[PDB]
């Protein structure tokens, strides 16, 4: 049950003026594509705060990747779901290498020692349903540079890969061998989604990761490994189970590789330079 929003004063949305004319802001299955200028964050923050939303963020830091955690977590503190309850889940082979990062109130961090493999690990299934409402699964070699907030939350979302958002579907680097579970033909495909940022309600994320893990097992059994590994399977899943929101490349950018085009008004979550 959802109580009433309080009175709020904000600019009237205007039916006969689009927010953004330069980009597609809704998919043909009527899922929002989240770009800056499409959302009023005050309205969304009220809606989510009224449900006492908790967001889990999962990140893997194995071997050398533990070096990326300090900047990742410190910048998540400045920019990710500020004002809402957050539970970071750090999966690592080195628990004593996780940096001590000061957290804001209502935010917690769990270290989970571990011995493509992210899909199996994420799919933890009992714990997540009891502790968070949504799960967001990202790469650790990244930093937040701007607001990443509740505008992303929805049953199931993927993020446009920054190298492919302008590309025709034949150019997408989908798995193209019919022998793989991840196979997608050249006349199919909506978008190319990056493996580095996806999420959803706990139930939807567990469904996805369970499906991708079972498809990867089948492929392994069969002597085949998809061209872009878990990302290839992520893309097959989201082709057949349409996400309820799609994040624009503001949410996964590499400024060194791609610059700062006019279509990106904010660069929110970005790659960190790495040898
Ligand atoms: O040795 C490794 C290799 C990969 N990863 C995790 O796997 C993610 C995806 O791999 P990576 O970022 O290396 O691939 P890329 O983004 O360069 O294609 C990394 O962010 C880490 O979260 C890790 O923790 N240790
Ligand atoms: O073509 C797909 C690939 O594109 C690269 O730019 C990216 O670094 C890879 O991780 C993979 O997503
Ligand atoms: Mn990465």
Short mmCIF file of C-alpha atoms and ligand atoms in Angstrom, two decimals:
data_model
loop_
_atom_site.label_atom_id
_atom_site.label_comp_id
_atom_site.label_asym_id
_atom_site.label_seq_id
_atom_site.Cartn_x
_atom_site.Cartn_y
_atom_site.Cartn_z
CA UNK A 1 0.00 0.00 0.00
CA UNK A 2 1.39 3.45 -1.03
CA UNK A 3 0.44 6.55 1.09
CA UNK A 4 -0.17 9.95 -0.59
CA UNK A 5 2.61 12.19 -1.68
CA UNK A 6 2.70 15.45 0.22
CA UNK A 7 1.94 18.76 -1.55
CA UNK A 8 4.87 19.70 -3.74
CA UNK A 9 5.58 22.75 -5.94
CA UNK A 10 7.41 22.13 -9.21
CA UNK A 11 7.24 23.24 -12.92
CA UNK A 12 4.10 21.94 -14.74
CA UNK A 13 5.06 19.23 -17.24
CA UNK A 14 3.92 20.38 -20.68
CA UNK A 15 2.23 17.88 -22.97
CA UNK A 16 3.18 19.70 -26.19
CA UNK A 17 6.83 20.23 -25.18
CA UNK A 18 9.02 17.05 -25.04
CA UNK A 19 11.67 16.97 -22.30
CA UNK A 20 14.28 15.81 -24.76
CA UNK A 21 13.90 15.82 -28.57
CA UNK A 22 17.38 14.57 -29.37
CA UNK A 23 17.07 11.04 -27.96
CA UNK A 24 14.54 8.18 -27.60
CA UNK A 25 13.11 8.39 -24.03
CA UNK A 26 10.77 5.37 -24.18
CA UNK A 27 11.27 1.93 -25.68
CA UNK A 28 8.64 0.45 -28.03
CA UNK A 29 7.57 -1.77 -25.06
CA UNK A 30 6.87 1.48 -23.14
CA UNK A 31 9.84 1.23 -20.76
CA UNK A 32 11.41 4.60 -19.85
CA UNK A 33 14.93 5.29 -21.15
CA UNK A 34 16.51 7.32 -18.37
CA UNK A 35 18.31 10.44 -19.54
CA UNK A 36 18.90 13.70 -17.71
CA UNK A 37 15.85 16.00 -18.19
CA UNK A 38 13.32 13.10 -18.23
CA UNK A 39 12.76 12.91 -14.43
CA UNK A 40 12.01 15.14 -11.51
CA UNK A 41 14.18 13.56 -8.81
CA UNK A 42 12.23 15.25 -5.99
CA UNK A 43 9.04 13.45 -6.99
CA UNK A 44 10.87 10.13 -7.37
CA UNK A 45 12.78 10.54 -4.05
CA UNK A 46 9.42 11.12 -2.25
CA UNK A 47 7.88 8.07 -3.90
CA UNK A 48 10.80 5.81 -2.95
CA UNK A 49 11.42 7.24 0.52
CA UNK A 50 7.69 6.71 1.33
CA UNK A 51 8.26 2.97 0.75
CA UNK A 52 11.42 2.99 2.95
CA UNK A 53 13.31 1.52 0.01
CA UNK A 54 16.56 -0.35 0.54
CA UNK A 55 19.00 -0.78 -2.32
CA UNK A 56 21.65 -3.53 -2.41
CA UNK A 57 24.72 -2.88 -4.53
CA UNK A 58 26.85 -5.82 -5.48
CA UNK A 59 30.44 -5.58 -6.60
CA UNK A 60 33.19 -8.18 -7.18
CA UNK A 61 36.74 -7.40 -6.33
CA UNK A 62 39.00 -10.43 -6.98
CA UNK A 63 42.79 -10.51 -7.17
CA UNK A 64 44.15 -7.13 -8.34
CA UNK A 65 40.63 -5.58 -8.48
CA UNK A 66 40.61 -4.96 -4.81
CA UNK A 67 42.66 -1.81 -5.59
CA UNK A 68 39.53 -0.21 -7.19
CA UNK A 69 37.32 -0.48 -4.07
CA UNK A 70 38.41 2.66 -2.22
CA UNK A 71 37.52 5.14 -5.04
CA UNK A 72 34.45 3.03 -6.03
CA UNK A 73 32.99 3.11 -2.46
CA UNK A 74 33.99 6.67 -1.62
CA UNK A 75 32.39 8.02 -4.79
CA UNK A 76 29.28 5.74 -4.28
CA UNK A 77 29.03 7.47 -0.94
CA UNK A 78 28.87 10.86 -2.61
CA UNK A 79 26.55 9.98 -5.49
CA UNK A 80 24.69 6.66 -5.22
CA UNK A 81 21.18 6.68 -3.66
CA UNK A 82 22.11 9.41 -1.16
CA UNK A 83 19.18 9.77 1.33
CA UNK A 84 18.05 6.18 0.85
CA UNK A 85 19.08 2.95 2.69
CA UNK A 86 21.96 1.19 0.94
CA UNK A 87 23.65 -2.21 1.57
CA UNK A 88 26.91 -2.73 -0.26
CA UNK A 89 27.84 -6.39 -0.86
CA UNK A 90 31.52 -6.77 -1.62
CA UNK A 91 32.54 -10.20 -2.92
CA UNK A 92 36.25 -10.74 -2.65
CA UNK A 93 39.02 -13.34 -2.31
CA UNK A 94 40.89 -10.88 0.02
CA UNK A 95 38.65 -9.73 2.91
CA UNK A 96 41.55 -7.94 4.69
CA UNK A 97 42.26 -5.82 1.53
CA UNK A 98 38.79 -4.18 1.53
CA UNK A 99 39.48 -0.46 2.52
CA UNK A 100 37.74 1.03 5.61
CA UNK A 101 35.47 3.60 3.96
CA UNK A 102 33.35 5.91 6.14
CA UNK A 103 29.66 5.46 5.38
CA UNK A 104 26.72 7.88 5.72
CA UNK A 105 23.86 7.05 8.02
CA UNK A 106 21.53 4.19 6.86
CA UNK A 107 24.31 2.67 4.78
CA UNK A 108 26.06 -0.64 5.43
CA UNK A 109 28.74 -2.81 3.90
CA UNK A 110 29.07 -6.62 4.02
CA UNK A 111 32.26 -8.41 2.95
CA UNK A 112 31.46 -11.87 1.39
CA UNK A 113 34.47 -14.09 0.87
CA UNK A 114 34.50 -16.17 -2.23
CA UNK A 115 36.80 -18.99 -3.38
CA UNK A 116 31.10 -15.30 -15.68
CA UNK A 117 30.99 -16.72 -12.06
CA UNK A 118 29.23 -13.49 -10.77
CA UNK A 119 25.84 -14.83 -12.09
CA UNK A 120 26.16 -18.03 -10.01
CA UNK A 121 27.31 -16.17 -6.93
CA UNK A 122 24.60 -13.51 -7.13
CA UNK A 123 21.92 -16.20 -7.63
CA UNK A 124 22.89 -15.33 -1.45
CA UNK A 125 19.26 -16.15 -2.44
CA UNK A 126 17.30 -15.82 0.83
CA UNK A 127 19.68 -13.21 2.24
CA UNK A 128 18.99 -10.64 -0.47
CA UNK A 129 15.19 -11.09 -0.22
CA UNK A 130 15.37 -10.45 3.44
CA UNK A 131 17.68 -7.37 3.42
CA UNK A 132 17.05 -5.26 0.30
CA UNK A 133 14.18 -4.30 -2.09
CA UNK A 134 16.34 -3.86 -5.24
CA UNK A 135 19.69 -5.15 -6.31
CA UNK A 136 22.11 -3.26 -8.61
CA UNK A 137 25.08 -5.31 -9.95
CA UNK A 138 28.08 -3.28 -11.19
CA UNK A 139 31.76 -3.47 -12.12
CA UNK A 140 34.24 -2.33 -9.43
CA UNK A 141 36.75 -0.59 -11.79
CA UNK A 142 34.52 2.52 -11.98
CA UNK A 143 33.78 5.70 -10.07
CA UNK A 144 30.65 7.69 -9.63
CA UNK A 145 31.00 11.29 -10.88
CA UNK A 146 27.37 12.40 -10.59
CA UNK A 147 23.92 11.46 -9.28
CA UNK A 148 22.85 7.77 -9.65
CA UNK A 149 19.56 7.56 -7.79
CA UNK A 150 16.11 6.03 -7.55
CA UNK A 151 15.27 7.05 -11.12
CA UNK A 152 16.95 3.74 -12.01
CA UNK A 153 14.76 1.52 -9.88
CA UNK A 154 12.14 -0.74 -11.50
CA UNK A 155 11.53 -4.46 -11.67
CA UNK A 156 14.29 -5.08 -14.25
CA UNK A 157 16.78 -2.70 -16.00
CA UNK A 158 19.71 -2.83 -18.36
CA UNK A 159 22.12 -0.07 -19.38
CA UNK A 160 23.05 0.94 -22.98
CA UNK A 161 26.63 0.03 -23.71
CA UNK A 162 28.46 3.27 -24.39
CA UNK A 163 30.24 1.94 -27.52
CA UNK A 164 27.00 0.80 -29.23
CA UNK A 165 24.11 3.12 -28.42
CA UNK A 166 24.39 4.69 -31.94
CA UNK A 167 24.92 1.34 -33.71
CA UNK A 168 22.58 -0.73 -35.98
CA UNK A 169 21.78 -4.14 -34.60
CA UNK A 170 23.89 -6.07 -37.17
CA UNK A 171 26.97 -4.34 -35.68
CA UNK A 172 26.11 -5.41 -32.12
CA UNK A 173 28.68 -7.84 -30.72
CA UNK A 174 25.98 -10.38 -29.73
CA UNK A 175 26.82 -14.07 -29.72
CA UNK A 176 26.29 -15.06 -33.39
CA UNK A 177 26.95 -18.87 -33.29
CA UNK A 178 23.63 -20.80 -33.22
CA UNK A 179 25.40 -23.37 -31.02
CA UNK A 180 25.33 -21.03 -28.00
CA UNK A 181 22.38 -20.42 -25.64
CA UNK A 182 23.26 -16.69 -25.98
CA UNK A 183 22.80 -16.82 -29.77
CA UNK A 184 21.07 -13.83 -31.39
CA UNK A 185 20.58 -13.55 -35.20
CA UNK A 186 21.36 -10.45 -37.21
CA UNK A 187 17.70 -9.45 -37.68
CA UNK A 188 16.99 -9.52 -33.91
CA UNK A 189 18.01 -7.26 -31.05
CA UNK A 190 16.77 -4.04 -29.49
CA UNK A 191 19.91 -2.63 -27.83
CA UNK A 192 23.34 -3.68 -26.79
CA UNK A 193 23.39 -3.77 -22.98
CA UNK A 194 26.67 -3.65 -21.05
CA UNK A 195 27.35 -6.37 -18.43
CA UNK A 196 28.80 -3.74 -16.13
CA UNK A 197 25.49 -2.22 -14.77
CA UNK A 198 22.12 -4.08 -14.53
CA UNK A 199 19.58 -4.54 -11.67
CA UNK A 200 16.01 -4.76 -10.64
CA UNK A 201 13.87 -6.04 -7.80
CA UNK A 202 15.59 -8.95 -5.92
CA UNK A 203 13.20 -11.44 -7.51
CA UNK A 204 13.84 -10.22 -11.04
CA UNK A 205 17.63 -10.09 -10.59
CA UNK A 206 17.65 -13.61 -9.12
CA UNK A 207 15.62 -14.78 -12.12
CA UNK A 208 17.98 -13.20 -14.54
CA UNK A 209 21.16 -14.45 -12.87
CA UNK A 210 19.63 -17.94 -12.48
CA UNK A 211 18.71 -17.99 -16.17
CA UNK A 212 22.19 -16.70 -17.26
CA UNK A 213 23.94 -19.21 -14.98
CA UNK A 214 21.86 -22.14 -16.35
CA UNK A 215 22.52 -20.97 -19.97
CA UNK A 216 26.30 -20.68 -19.25
CA UNK A 217 26.26 -24.29 -17.82
CA UNK A 218 24.59 -25.54 -20.99
CA UNK A 219 27.17 -23.78 -23.14
CA UNK A 220 30.06 -25.23 -21.00
CA UNK A 221 28.59 -28.75 -21.20
CA UNK A 222 28.56 -28.17 -25.00
CA UNK A 223 32.15 -26.95 -25.50
CA UNK A 224 31.26 -23.33 -26.22
CA UNK A 225 32.01 -20.01 -24.51
CA UNK A 226 30.06 -16.89 -25.55
CA UNK A 227 32.05 -14.13 -27.30
CA UNK A 228 31.45 -11.63 -24.49
CA UNK A 229 30.86 -14.13 -21.67
CA UNK A 230 28.16 -13.12 -19.17
CA UNK A 231 27.36 -9.98 -21.11
CA UNK A 232 26.41 -12.15 -24.12
CA UNK A 233 23.90 -14.05 -21.96
CA UNK A 234 22.66 -10.86 -20.29
CA UNK A 235 21.83 -9.60 -23.78
CA UNK A 236 19.95 -12.75 -24.77
CA UNK A 237 17.94 -12.57 -21.50
CA UNK A 238 16.99 -8.96 -21.95
CA UNK A 239 16.04 -9.54 -25.60
CA UNK A 240 13.57 -12.26 -24.48
CA UNK A 241 12.46 -10.54 -21.14
CA UNK A 242 12.19 -6.83 -21.88
CA UNK A 243 13.57 -4.60 -19.15
CA UNK A 244 11.06 -2.25 -17.49
CA UNK A 245 13.56 0.65 -17.66
CA UNK A 246 16.69 1.14 -19.78
CA UNK A 247 19.50 3.35 -18.49
CA UNK A 248 21.14 5.74 -21.02
CA UNK A 249 24.99 5.76 -21.42
CA UNK A 250 25.10 8.60 -18.86
CA UNK A 251 25.08 5.60 -16.45
CA UNK A 252 28.08 3.74 -17.96
CA UNK A 253 30.60 5.97 -19.74
CA UNK A 254 34.36 6.02 -20.56
CA UNK A 255 35.40 9.61 -21.09
CA UNK A 256 39.01 8.67 -22.06
CA UNK A 257 37.74 6.39 -24.85
CA UNK A 258 34.66 8.40 -25.88
CA UNK A 259 34.93 12.01 -24.81
CA UNK A 260 31.92 14.05 -23.74
CA UNK A 261 29.33 14.28 -26.54
CA UNK A 262 26.53 16.82 -26.45
CA UNK A 263 23.90 14.11 -26.05
CA UNK A 264 25.32 13.31 -22.56
CA UNK A 265 24.37 16.08 -20.18
CA UNK A 266 25.86 14.22 -17.20
CA UNK A 267 28.57 11.53 -16.98
CA UNK A 268 27.38 9.71 -13.82
CA UNK A 269 29.32 6.44 -13.54
CA UNK A 270 32.58 6.05 -15.49
CA UNK A 271 35.53 3.75 -16.17
CA UNK A 272 38.74 4.25 -14.24
CA UNK A 273 41.99 4.27 -16.27
CA UNK A 274 43.74 0.88 -15.81
CA UNK A 275 47.05 -0.36 -17.46
O1 LIG B 1 40.67 -10.43 -12.11
C1 LIG B 1 39.51 -10.00 -12.06
C2 LIG B 1 38.75 -9.90 -13.23
C3 LIG B 1 37.44 -9.38 -13.14
N1 LIG B 1 36.86 -8.95 -11.90
C4 LIG B 1 35.49 -8.41 -11.80
O2 LIG B 1 34.90 -8.54 -13.12
C5 LIG B 1 34.51 -7.23 -13.55
C6 LIG B 1 34.47 -7.30 -15.10
O3 LIG B 1 35.73 -7.55 -15.65
P1 LIG B 1 36.61 -6.34 -16.17
O4 LIG B 1 36.15 -5.05 -15.53
O5 LIG B 1 37.99 -6.76 -16.06
O6 LIG B 1 36.20 -6.37 -17.72
P2 LIG B 1 36.03 -5.03 -18.63
O7 LIG B 1 35.10 -4.04 -18.10
O8 LIG B 1 37.50 -4.39 -18.85
O9 LIG B 1 35.59 -5.55 -20.07
C7 LIG B 1 35.53 -6.31 -12.84
O10 LIG B 1 34.97 -5.02 -12.65
C8 LIG B 1 35.57 -6.90 -11.45
O11 LIG B 1 34.40 -6.44 -10.81
C9 LIG B 1 37.58 -9.04 -10.70
O12 LIG B 1 37.04 -8.66 -9.64
N2 LIG B 1 38.94 -9.57 -10.79
O1 LIG B 2 31.82 -5.43 -27.77
C1 LIG B 2 31.57 -5.71 -26.40
C2 LIG B 2 32.82 -5.31 -25.59
O2 LIG B 2 33.06 -3.95 -25.79
C3 LIG B 2 34.23 -3.46 -25.13
O3 LIG B 2 34.37 -2.08 -25.34
C4 LIG B 2 34.15 -3.66 -23.63
O4 LIG B 2 35.33 -3.21 -23.03
C5 LIG B 2 34.00 -5.14 -23.39
O5 LIG B 2 34.01 -5.38 -22.02
C6 LIG B 2 32.73 -5.66 -24.11
O6 LIG B 2 31.59 -5.07 -23.54
MN1 LIG B 3 34.87 -3.29 -16.01
#
